[PDB]
């Protein structure tokens, strides 16, 4: 459902 629009910035 949710995309890496939960984070993404590696780290």
């Amino acid at each position, epitope marked *: *459902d*949710a995309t890496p*629009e939960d*984070l993404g910035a*590696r780290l």
Partner: antibody
Amino acid sequence: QDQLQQSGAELVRPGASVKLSCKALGYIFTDYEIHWVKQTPVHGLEWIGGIHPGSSGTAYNQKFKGKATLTADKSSTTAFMELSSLTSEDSAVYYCTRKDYWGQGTLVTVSA
Amino acid sequence: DIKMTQSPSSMYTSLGERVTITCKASQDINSFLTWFLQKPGKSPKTLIYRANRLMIGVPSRFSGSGSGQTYSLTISSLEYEDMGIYYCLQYDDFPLTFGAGTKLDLKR
């Protein structure tokens, strides 16, 4: 699917260490960061840090830099958090999260 | 460190009632916020991600809004299943930060 399953309760002695695990199921492990959160009656919720299984990148709460170590293992789609020099102040429930999904948590009790 | 000021801290409510909870970021967080609920002795359950997106499986009586520093979680009609503590989480920038949460309680 959408799931994070955490290792069982831990009963550990002061000065010792523990390594907690967080199995990821239902999504692509190397596409999302996995984070760990501490929760205690007295201190509430506290972000510890995160790891990106894909790039292996990490970010820690300054407060845990040197106390907690985050690692991830691609082949078993499992994130890990190791805590050293346990001290009762570390007795708490620990959660791994993807920010949307949350593990069921792991109870850690530091006692002699 | 972004500070999330959440309010009210305590909610005295009735079933069927409409409920609004608020989180104010000490700075712009660009809708990178989640609203989750936690019941006694249970693990957190996310209701909303990215300020206004419904978590799959979550009932539509839940909705979020806001855009800069002010975000709100609204429960159109309170149900018994909804009792517990609500929390907001900002993840726009490290360290991840939480609101102090608001306790929902049935009035009488």
